[PDB]
Every structure is written in structure tokens, then in C-alpha cells.
mmCIF file of all heavy atoms in Angstrom:
data_model
loop_
_atom_site.group_PDB
_atom_site.id
_atom_site.type_symbol
_atom_site.label_atom_id
_atom_site.label_comp_id
_atom_site.label_asym_id
_atom_site.label_seq_id
_atom_site.Cartn_x
_atom_site.Cartn_y
_atom_site.Cartn_z
ATOM 1 N N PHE O 1 0.826 -1.202 0.000
ATOM 2 C CA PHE O 1 0.000 0.000 0.000
ATOM 3 C C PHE O 1 0.862 1.255 0.000
ATOM 4 O O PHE O 1 0.647 2.166 -0.809
ATOM 5 C CB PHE O 1 -0.935 -0.032 1.217
ATOM 6 C CG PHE O 1 -1.812 1.186 1.358
ATOM 7 C CD1 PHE O 1 -2.791 1.470 0.416
ATOM 8 C CD2 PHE O 1 -1.681 2.020 2.449
ATOM 9 C CE1 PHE O 1 -3.608 2.584 0.554
ATOM 10 C CE2 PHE O 1 -2.499 3.132 2.600
ATOM 11 C CZ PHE O 1 -3.462 3.416 1.663
ATOM 12 N N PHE O 2 1.847 1.322 0.907
ATOM 13 C CA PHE O 2 2.786 2.441 0.898
ATOM 14 C C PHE O 2 3.509 2.536 -0.437
ATOM 15 O O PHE O 2 3.653 3.624 -1.015
ATOM 16 C CB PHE O 2 3.799 2.285 2.028
ATOM 17 C CG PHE O 2 4.673 3.494 2.232
ATOM 18 C CD1 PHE O 2 4.278 4.517 3.084
ATOM 19 C CD2 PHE O 2 5.899 3.602 1.580
ATOM 20 C CE1 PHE O 2 5.078 5.629 3.276
ATOM 21 C CE2 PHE O 2 6.705 4.713 1.762
ATOM 22 C CZ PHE O 2 6.302 5.732 2.605
ATOM 23 N N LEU O 3 3.980 1.397 -0.938
ATOM 24 C CA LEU O 3 4.758 1.390 -2.167
ATOM 25 C C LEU O 3 3.922 1.855 -3.345
ATOM 26 O O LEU O 3 4.449 2.496 -4.262
ATOM 27 C CB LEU O 3 5.313 -0.013 -2.401
ATOM 28 C CG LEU O 3 6.197 -0.315 -3.613
ATOM 29 C CD1 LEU O 3 7.381 0.610 -3.600
ATOM 30 C CD2 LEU O 3 6.643 -1.792 -3.604
ATOM 31 N N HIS O 4 2.613 1.565 -3.330
ATOM 32 C CA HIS O 4 1.738 2.084 -4.376
ATOM 33 C C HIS O 4 1.827 3.596 -4.449
ATOM 34 O O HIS O 4 1.832 4.175 -5.543
ATOM 35 C CB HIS O 4 0.292 1.637 -4.137
ATOM 36 C CG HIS O 4 -0.707 2.266 -5.067
ATOM 37 N ND1 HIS O 4 -1.309 1.571 -6.093
ATOM 38 C CD2 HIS O 4 -1.221 3.518 -5.109
ATOM 39 C CE1 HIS O 4 -2.140 2.371 -6.736
ATOM 40 N NE2 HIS O 4 -2.107 3.558 -6.158
ATOM 41 N N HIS O 5 1.918 4.256 -3.291
ATOM 42 C CA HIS O 5 1.982 5.711 -3.290
ATOM 43 C C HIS O 5 3.338 6.207 -3.774
ATOM 44 O O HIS O 5 3.407 7.071 -4.655
ATOM 45 C CB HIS O 5 1.647 6.256 -1.900
ATOM 46 C CG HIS O 5 0.185 6.207 -1.584
ATOM 47 N ND1 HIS O 5 -0.635 7.312 -1.663
ATOM 48 C CD2 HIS O 5 -0.613 5.173 -1.228
ATOM 49 C CE1 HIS O 5 -1.868 6.966 -1.347
ATOM 50 N NE2 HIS O 5 -1.882 5.671 -1.087
ATOM 51 N N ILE O 6 4.432 5.665 -3.230
ATOM 52 C CA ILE O 6 5.727 6.256 -3.557
ATOM 53 C C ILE O 6 6.139 5.946 -4.993
ATOM 54 O O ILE O 6 6.873 6.727 -5.613
ATOM 55 C CB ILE O 6 6.816 5.817 -2.558
ATOM 56 C CG1 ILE O 6 8.047 6.736 -2.718
ATOM 57 C CG2 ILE O 6 7.179 4.350 -2.769
ATOM 58 C CD1 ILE O 6 9.003 6.755 -1.521
ATOM 59 N N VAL O 7 5.672 4.832 -5.558
ATOM 60 C CA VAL O 7 6.123 4.495 -6.901
ATOM 61 C C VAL O 7 5.528 5.467 -7.903
ATOM 62 O O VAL O 7 6.115 5.711 -8.967
ATOM 63 C CB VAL O 7 5.793 3.032 -7.245
ATOM 64 C CG1 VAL O 7 4.328 2.875 -7.513
ATOM 65 C CG2 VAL O 7 6.592 2.580 -8.459
ATOM 66 N N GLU O 8 4.384 6.074 -7.566
ATOM 67 C CA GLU O 8 3.832 7.134 -8.405
ATOM 68 C C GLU O 8 4.721 8.376 -8.393
ATOM 69 O O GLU O 8 4.937 8.997 -9.445
ATOM 70 C CB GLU O 8 2.410 7.473 -7.955
ATOM 71 C CG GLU O 8 1.760 8.506 -8.841
ATOM 72 C CD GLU O 8 1.544 7.987 -10.251
ATOM 73 O OE1 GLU O 8 0.992 6.882 -10.425
ATOM 74 O OE2 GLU O 8 1.919 8.678 -11.225
ATOM 75 N N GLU O 9 5.248 8.751 -7.214
ATOM 76 C CA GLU O 9 6.213 9.850 -7.121
ATOM 77 C C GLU O 9 7.491 9.530 -7.890
ATOM 78 O O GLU O 9 8.056 10.396 -8.571
ATOM 79 C CB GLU O 9 6.584 10.146 -5.658
ATOM 80 C CG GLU O 9 5.463 10.581 -4.716
ATOM 81 C CD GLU O 9 5.975 10.853 -3.290
ATOM 82 O OE1 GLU O 9 7.166 10.548 -2.998
ATOM 83 O OE2 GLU O 9 5.191 11.385 -2.468
ATOM 84 N N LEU O 10 8.007 8.305 -7.728
ATOM 85 C CA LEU O 10 9.252 7.953 -8.397
ATOM 86 C C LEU O 10 9.053 8.000 -9.899
ATOM 87 O O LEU O 10 9.921 8.472 -10.635
ATOM 88 C CB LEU O 10 9.737 6.567 -7.958
ATOM 89 C CG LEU O 10 10.006 6.310 -6.468
ATOM 90 C CD1 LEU O 10 10.415 4.861 -6.209
ATOM 91 C CD2 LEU O 10 11.046 7.249 -5.935
ATOM 92 N N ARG O 11 7.881 7.567 -10.361
ATOM 93 C CA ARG O 11 7.590 7.592 -11.785
ATOM 94 C C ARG O 11 7.675 9.012 -12.327
ATOM 95 O O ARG O 11 8.444 9.293 -13.262
ATOM 96 C CB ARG O 11 6.212 6.993 -12.029
ATOM 97 C CG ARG O 11 5.958 6.562 -13.439
ATOM 98 C CD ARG O 11 4.564 5.976 -13.554
ATOM 99 N NE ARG O 11 4.464 4.640 -12.973
ATOM 100 C CZ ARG O 11 3.714 4.318 -11.918
ATOM 101 N NH1 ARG O 11 2.983 5.234 -11.302
ATOM 102 N NH2 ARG O 11 3.690 3.063 -11.480
ATOM 103 N N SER O 12 6.927 9.938 -11.720
ATOM 104 C CA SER O 12 6.858 11.276 -12.284
ATOM 105 C C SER O 12 8.140 12.069 -12.049
ATOM 106 O O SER O 12 8.386 13.052 -12.757
ATOM 107 C CB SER O 12 5.636 12.025 -11.729
ATOM 108 O OG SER O 12 5.943 12.770 -10.567
ATOM 109 N N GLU O 13 8.973 11.680 -11.091
ATOM 110 C CA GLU O 13 10.216 12.421 -10.939
ATOM 111 C C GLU O 13 11.348 11.865 -11.785
ATOM 112 O O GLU O 13 12.270 12.612 -12.123
ATOM 113 C CB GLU O 13 10.651 12.471 -9.477
ATOM 114 C CG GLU O 13 9.760 13.360 -8.646
ATOM 115 C CD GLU O 13 10.382 14.722 -8.388
ATOM 116 O OE1 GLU O 13 11.510 14.806 -7.867
ATOM 117 O OE2 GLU O 13 9.724 15.729 -8.709
ATOM 118 N N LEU O 14 11.269 10.610 -12.192
ATOM 119 C CA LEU O 14 12.433 9.921 -12.709
ATOM 120 C C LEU O 14 12.295 9.421 -14.137
ATOM 121 O O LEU O 14 13.313 9.330 -14.830
ATOM 122 C CB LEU O 14 12.784 8.741 -11.794
ATOM 123 C CG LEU O 14 13.197 9.152 -10.383
ATOM 124 C CD1 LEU O 14 13.619 7.939 -9.568
ATOM 125 C CD2 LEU O 14 14.310 10.184 -10.443
ATOM 126 N N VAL O 15 11.082 9.088 -14.593
ATOM 127 C CA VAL O 15 10.945 8.460 -15.901
ATOM 128 C C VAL O 15 11.526 9.396 -16.954
ATOM 129 O O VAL O 15 11.382 10.620 -16.872
ATOM 130 C CB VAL O 15 9.476 8.077 -16.176
ATOM 131 C CG1 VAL O 15 9.245 7.689 -17.631
ATOM 132 C CG2 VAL O 15 9.085 6.902 -15.322
ATOM 133 N N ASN O 16 12.253 8.814 -17.910
ATOM 134 C CA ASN O 16 12.992 9.505 -18.960
ATOM 135 C C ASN O 16 14.199 10.250 -18.423
ATOM 136 O O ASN O 16 14.824 11.024 -19.166
ATOM 137 C CB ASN O 16 12.112 10.466 -19.761
ATOM 138 C CG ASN O 16 11.100 9.739 -20.595
ATOM 139 O OD1 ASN O 16 11.438 8.803 -21.326
ATOM 140 N ND2 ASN O 16 9.843 10.142 -20.481
ATOM 141 N N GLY O 17 14.547 10.043 -17.155
ATOM 142 C CA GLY O 17 15.812 10.508 -16.649
ATOM 143 C C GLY O 17 16.957 9.639 -17.129
ATOM 144 O O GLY O 17 16.777 8.626 -17.811
ATOM 145 N N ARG O 18 18.166 10.052 -16.755
ATOM 146 C CA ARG O 18 19.388 9.345 -17.106
ATOM 147 C C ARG O 18 20.113 8.986 -15.827
ATOM 148 O O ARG O 18 20.274 9.838 -14.951
ATOM 149 C CB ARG O 18 20.290 10.201 -17.995
ATOM 150 C CG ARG O 18 19.809 10.346 -19.431
ATOM 151 C CD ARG O 18 20.088 9.062 -20.243
ATOM 152 N NE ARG O 18 19.547 9.138 -21.606
ATOM 153 C CZ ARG O 18 19.685 8.190 -22.538
ATOM 154 N NH1 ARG O 18 20.350 7.067 -22.277
ATOM 155 N NH2 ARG O 18 19.153 8.365 -23.746
ATOM 156 N N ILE O 19 20.531 7.728 -15.712
ATOM 157 C CA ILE O 19 21.322 7.292 -14.568
ATOM 158 C C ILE O 19 22.756 7.728 -14.799
ATOM 159 O O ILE O 19 23.381 7.322 -15.783
ATOM 160 C CB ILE O 19 21.245 5.775 -14.373
ATOM 161 C CG1 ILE O 19 19.804 5.342 -14.118
ATOM 162 C CG2 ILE O 19 22.141 5.349 -13.224
ATOM 163 C CD1 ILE O 19 19.605 3.867 -14.236
ATOM 164 N N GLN O 20 23.279 8.551 -13.889
ATOM 165 C CA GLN O 20 24.597 9.139 -14.035
ATOM 166 C C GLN O 20 25.645 8.530 -13.125
ATOM 167 O O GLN O 20 26.838 8.661 -13.413
ATOM 168 C CB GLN O 20 24.538 10.651 -13.762
ATOM 169 C CG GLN O 20 24.017 11.492 -14.920
ATOM 170 C CD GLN O 20 23.815 12.945 -14.529
ATOM 171 O OE1 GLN O 20 23.572 13.256 -13.364
ATOM 172 N NE2 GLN O 20 23.905 13.840 -15.499
ATOM 173 N N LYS O 21 25.247 7.885 -12.036
ATOM 174 C CA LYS O 21 26.225 7.369 -11.089
ATOM 175 C C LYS O 21 25.591 6.208 -10.333
ATOM 176 O O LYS O 21 24.388 6.212 -10.070
ATOM 177 C CB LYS O 21 26.704 8.477 -10.142
ATOM 178 C CG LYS O 21 28.051 8.210 -9.530
ATOM 179 C CD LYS O 21 28.456 9.285 -8.517
ATOM 180 C CE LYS O 21 29.714 8.847 -7.719
ATOM 181 N NZ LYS O 21 30.210 9.898 -6.767
ATOM 182 N N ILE O 22 26.400 5.197 -10.020
ATOM 183 C CA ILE O 22 25.909 3.960 -9.432
ATOM 184 C C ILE O 22 26.907 3.529 -8.365
ATOM 185 O O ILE O 22 28.073 3.259 -8.676
ATOM 186 C CB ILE O 22 25.728 2.856 -10.497
ATOM 187 C CG1 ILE O 22 24.629 3.216 -11.498
ATOM 188 C CG2 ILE O 22 25.399 1.528 -9.872
ATOM 189 C CD1 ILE O 22 25.129 3.256 -12.945
ATOM 190 N N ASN O 23 26.458 3.461 -7.111
ATOM 191 C CA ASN O 23 27.310 3.056 -5.997
ATOM 192 C C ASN O 23 26.551 2.142 -5.041
ATOM 193 O O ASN O 23 25.315 2.104 -5.025
ATOM 194 C CB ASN O 23 27.838 4.255 -5.213
ATOM 195 C CG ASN O 23 28.649 5.187 -6.070
ATOM 196 O OD1 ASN O 23 28.097 6.066 -6.729
ATOM 197 N ND2 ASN O 23 29.970 4.991 -6.089
ATOM 198 N N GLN O 24 27.334 1.418 -4.232
ATOM 199 C CA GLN O 24 26.880 0.485 -3.204
ATOM 200 C C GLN O 24 27.455 0.944 -1.862
ATOM 201 O O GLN O 24 28.456 0.386 -1.383
ATOM 202 C CB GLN O 24 27.333 -0.934 -3.548
ATOM 203 C CG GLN O 24 26.952 -2.047 -2.590
ATOM 204 C CD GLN O 24 27.415 -3.419 -3.087
ATOM 205 O OE1 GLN O 24 28.147 -3.509 -4.080
ATOM 206 N NE2 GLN O 24 26.986 -4.488 -2.405
ATOM 207 N N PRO O 25 26.860 1.966 -1.227
ATOM 208 C CA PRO O 25 27.434 2.455 0.045
ATOM 209 C C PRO O 25 27.439 1.414 1.149
ATOM 210 O O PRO O 25 28.424 1.314 1.888
ATOM 211 C CB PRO O 25 26.561 3.672 0.402
ATOM 212 C CG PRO O 25 25.395 3.626 -0.495
ATOM 213 C CD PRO O 25 25.733 2.792 -1.699
ATOM 214 N N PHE O 26 26.384 0.619 1.276
ATOM 215 C CA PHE O 26 26.385 -0.509 2.196
ATOM 216 C C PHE O 26 26.178 -1.792 1.405
ATOM 217 O O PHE O 26 25.819 -1.760 0.224
ATOM 218 C CB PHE O 26 25.314 -0.337 3.274
ATOM 219 C CG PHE O 26 25.487 0.918 4.066
ATOM 220 C CD1 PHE O 26 24.729 2.046 3.779
ATOM 221 C CD2 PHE O 26 26.439 0.986 5.072
ATOM 222 C CE1 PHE O 26 24.893 3.214 4.499
ATOM 223 C CE2 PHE O 26 26.613 2.157 5.805
ATOM 224 C CZ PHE O 26 25.841 3.273 5.515
ATOM 225 N N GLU O 27 26.406 -2.929 2.071
ATOM 226 C CA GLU O 27 26.440 -4.204 1.361
ATOM 227 C C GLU O 27 25.151 -4.455 0.589
ATOM 228 O O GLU O 27 25.181 -4.865 -0.579
ATOM 229 C CB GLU O 27 26.717 -5.348 2.338
ATOM 230 C CG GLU O 27 27.293 -6.585 1.670
ATOM 231 C CD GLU O 27 28.775 -6.432 1.336
ATOM 232 O OE1 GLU O 27 29.122 -5.642 0.427
ATOM 233 O OE2 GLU O 27 29.612 -7.094 1.989
ATOM 234 N N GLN O 28 24.004 -4.198 1.213
ATOM 235 C CA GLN O 28 22.729 -4.512 0.586
ATOM 236 C C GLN O 28 21.979 -3.258 0.166
ATOM 237 O O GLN O 28 20.747 -3.249 0.119
ATOM 238 C CB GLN O 28 21.863 -5.351 1.514
ATOM 239 C CG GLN O 28 22.634 -6.361 2.349
ATOM 240 C CD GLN O 28 21.794 -6.845 3.511
ATOM 241 O OE1 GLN O 28 20.923 -7.709 3.337
ATOM 242 N NE2 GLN O 28 22.019 -6.266 4.704
ATOM 243 N N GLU O 29 22.700 -2.188 -0.131
ATOM 244 C CA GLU O 29 22.055 -0.955 -0.533
ATOM 245 C C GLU O 29 22.670 -0.440 -1.822
ATOM 246 O O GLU O 29 23.886 -0.490 -2.010
ATOM 247 C CB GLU O 29 22.153 0.093 0.580
ATOM 248 C CG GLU O 29 21.666 -0.426 1.914
ATOM 249 C CD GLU O 29 21.111 0.659 2.802
ATOM 250 O OE1 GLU O 29 21.448 1.848 2.606
ATOM 251 O OE2 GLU O 29 20.313 0.316 3.701
ATOM 252 N N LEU O 30 21.818 0.052 -2.709
ATOM 253 C CA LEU O 30 22.219 0.576 -4.005
ATOM 254 C C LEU O 30 21.685 1.994 -4.132
ATOM 255 O O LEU O 30 20.502 2.231 -3.869
ATOM 256 C CB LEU O 30 21.678 -0.316 -5.140
ATOM 257 C CG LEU O 30 21.847 0.174 -6.576
ATOM 258 C CD1 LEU O 30 23.327 0.118 -6.984
ATOM 259 C CD2 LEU O 30 20.950 -0.594 -7.551
ATOM 260 N N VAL O 31 22.545 2.926 -4.542
ATOM 261 C CA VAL O 31 22.183 4.326 -4.733
ATOM 262 C C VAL O 31 22.501 4.742 -6.164
ATOM 263 O O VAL O 31 23.627 4.559 -6.633
ATOM 264 C CB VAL O 31 22.904 5.239 -3.728
ATOM 265 C CG1 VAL O 31 22.566 6.703 -3.996
ATOM 266 C CG2 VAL O 31 22.506 4.869 -2.322
ATOM 267 N N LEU O 32 21.515 5.314 -6.846
ATOM 268 C CA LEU O 32 21.660 5.815 -8.204
ATOM 269 C C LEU O 32 21.522 7.333 -8.200
ATOM 270 O O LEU O 32 20.538 7.865 -7.675
ATOM 271 C CB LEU O 32 20.592 5.223 -9.136
ATOM 272 C CG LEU O 32 20.319 3.723 -9.131
ATOM 273 C CD1 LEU O 32 19.325 3.369 -10.216
ATOM 274 C CD2 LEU O 32 21.616 2.951 -9.341
ATOM 275 N N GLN O 33 22.487 8.031 -8.794
ATOM 276 C CA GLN O 33 22.296 9.435 -9.129
ATOM 277 C C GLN O 33 21.623 9.500 -10.494
ATOM 278 O O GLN O 33 22.133 8.934 -11.471
ATOM 279 C CB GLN O 33 23.619 10.198 -9.134
ATOM 280 C CG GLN O 33 23.459 11.704 -8.956
ATOM 281 C CD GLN O 33 24.570 12.486 -9.642
ATOM 282 O OE1 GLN O 33 24.331 13.172 -10.646
ATOM 283 N NE2 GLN O 33 25.794 12.386 -9.109
ATOM 284 N N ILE O 34 20.468 10.161 -10.560
ATOM 285 C CA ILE O 34 19.662 10.207 -11.772
ATOM 286 C C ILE O 34 19.381 11.659 -12.108
ATOM 287 O O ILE O 34 18.887 12.406 -11.261
ATOM 288 C CB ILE O 34 18.341 9.433 -11.613
ATOM 289 C CG1 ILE O 34 18.593 7.934 -11.461
ATOM 290 C CG2 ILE O 34 17.405 9.695 -12.783
ATOM 291 C CD1 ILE O 34 17.421 7.204 -10.804
ATOM 292 N N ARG O 35 19.686 12.053 -13.339
ATOM 293 C CA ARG O 35 19.346 13.378 -13.835
ATOM 294 C C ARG O 35 18.024 13.298 -14.578
ATOM 295 O O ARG O 35 17.837 12.418 -15.428
ATOM 296 C CB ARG O 35 20.436 13.920 -14.762
ATOM 297 C CG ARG O 35 20.074 15.243 -15.422
ATOM 298 C CD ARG O 35 21.307 15.943 -15.961
ATOM 299 N NE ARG O 35 21.012 17.300 -16.413
ATOM 300 C CZ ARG O 35 20.916 18.360 -15.610
ATOM 301 N NH1 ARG O 35 21.074 18.235 -14.291
ATOM 302 N NH2 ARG O 35 20.650 19.553 -16.132
ATOM 303 N N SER O 36 17.122 14.228 -14.272
ATOM 304 C CA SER O 36 15.770 14.203 -14.804
ATOM 305 C C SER O 36 15.138 15.574 -14.620
ATOM 306 O O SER O 36 15.268 16.176 -13.552
ATOM 307 C CB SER O 36 14.940 13.144 -14.094
ATOM 308 O OG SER O 36 13.922 12.692 -14.954
ATOM 309 N N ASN O 37 14.453 16.058 -15.661
ATOM 310 C CA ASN O 37 13.840 17.395 -15.651
ATOM 311 C C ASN O 37 14.848 18.464 -15.231
ATOM 312 O O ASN O 37 14.552 19.342 -14.417
ATOM 313 C CB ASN O 37 12.603 17.441 -14.742
ATOM 314 C CG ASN O 37 11.710 16.210 -14.895
ATOM 315 O OD1 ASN O 37 11.116 15.978 -15.955
ATOM 316 N ND2 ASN O 37 11.606 15.416 -13.825
#
């Protein structure tokens, strides 16, 4: 239910963006720098 809400935000902020940087700060965590709008 929560994810239904946030995935709508992620869609409108990120779709058609470009992934510019990819790192693994912790073992099971992934962080993407994304340029968009």
C-alpha cells in the first residue's frame, strides 16, 4: 500500500531521466544518481 503511493512519485520524478552514477554504500544498498527534468 505504501509502495503504491511512492512508486507514483518515483515515476513522475524519474521516468525519462538518465542514470549518471551507481554506488553500493552498504552491502545490501544501491544508490543511483539520476538526472531528470
Side-chain angles (χ1 to χ4, degrees):
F1 178 66
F2 189 89
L3 181 56
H4 173 107
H5 284 259
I6 195 160
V7 74
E8 183 65 50
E9 299 180 352
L10 302 177
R11 198 180 285 116
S12 92
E13 289 259 305
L14 296 184
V15 168
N16 292 310
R18 286 284 176 177
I19 299 167
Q20 281 173 333
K21 203 184 170 176
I22 294 122
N23 301 86
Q24 180 177 8
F26 302 99
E27 202 77 290
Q28 323 163 79
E29 308 209 338
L30 172 70
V31 177
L32 312 185
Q33 202 209 111
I34 293 159
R35 174 162 189 81
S36 207
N37 317 294

